[PDB]
């Protein structure tokens, strides 16, 4: 179906402890493929998926060049923002930036994004039309006007609609066996006695890709949303994901409960019951 490429950048000032930390990561869908860490030894963009490793030296030199430029930009931006908000020189602050593109099932442009945050909240973002900006506060209205007059939207729009989508297409085909796979969850239920009169039913989904999944419990076909223990979807470490959902059941009531699993990889949604 749909696919995405996203870059995520984090810059953290360290007053009286040297240069700000800068970390950049790239993803296609739920798979990381590159990284840069200002505190690492290489000072280069580095591969994090096997399928990007076969890009040649011109790729890696070019990506290293651009990410150091991103790094320098952000170094400068931390100072600008400290002034804007009249903050002391001594405190650690955070800038985050995210951009990339979505393609549809036709692998043609679907949506573009470019978002910017300061200390954990919205600062400025490119709107959906990729032609205008949303400034979160009064400081960001200054940036909005600066960026309008320098035509920053125009430059990003050409990237997000053109080159971003072209590279996404190339990564998808070069990493076909990683990126164009769907791994259906392996599912099962566990039963454990909380006491003589109560037991936990835990419904498991394991080793699935992509991360998008829905796990729910019903009792006699009624939603148990407010009485289900649901964990956040979590990485297994091997590029697959995990999720579980548990309910507490009065003993004797096991057959009343059903766990329901929806995932891209299942031909049909599953309904699991204990005995």
């Amino acid at each position: 179906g749909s696919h995405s490429m996203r870059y995520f950048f984090t810059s953290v000032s360290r007053p009286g402890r040297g240069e700000p930390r800068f970390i950049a990561v790239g993803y296609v869908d739920d798979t990381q493929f590159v990284r840069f860490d200002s505190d690492a030894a290489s000072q280069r963009m580095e591969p994090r998926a096997p399928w990007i490793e076969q890009e040649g030296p011109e790729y890696w030199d070019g990506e290293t060049r651009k990410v150091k430029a991103h790094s320098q930009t952000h170094r400068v931006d931390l100072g600008t923002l400290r002034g804007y908000y009249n903050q002391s020189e001594a405190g650690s602050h955070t800038v985050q930036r995210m951009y990339g593109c979505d393609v549809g099932s036709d692998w043609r442009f679907l949506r573009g994004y470019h978002q910017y945050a300061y200390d954990g909240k919205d600062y400025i973002a490119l709107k959906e039309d990729l032609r205008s900006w949303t400034a979160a506060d009064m400081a960001a209205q200054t940036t909005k006007h600066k960026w309008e007059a320098a035509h920053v939207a125009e430059q990003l729009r050409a990237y997000l609609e053109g080159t971003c989508v072209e590279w996404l297409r190339r990564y998808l085909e070069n990493g076909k066996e990683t990126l164009q796979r769907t791994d259906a969850p392996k599912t099962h239920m566990t039963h454990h006695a909380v006491s003589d009169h109560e037991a936990t039913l835990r419904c498991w989904a394991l080793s699935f890709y992509p991360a998008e999944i829905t796990l729910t419990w019903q009792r006699d076909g009624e939603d148990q949303t407010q009485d289900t223990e649901l964990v956040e979807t979590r990485p297994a470490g091997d590029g697959t994901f995990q999720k579980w959902a548990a309910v507490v059941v009065p003993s004797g009531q096991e057959q009343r409960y059903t766990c329901h699993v929806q995932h891209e990889g299942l031909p049909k949604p599953l309904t699991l019951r204990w005995e």
């Binding site: 870059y7 790239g26 790729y59 070019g62 990506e63 651009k66 990410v67 430029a69 991103h70 930009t73 400068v76 931006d77 600008t80 923002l81 951009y99 940036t143 600066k146 960026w147 320098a150 920053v152 430059q155 990003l156 990237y159 080159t163 590279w167």
Partner: peptide, 10 residues
Amino acid sequence: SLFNTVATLY
């Protein structure tokens, strides 16, 4: 591939 022309706030 990264954007080639990332601009400062100022």
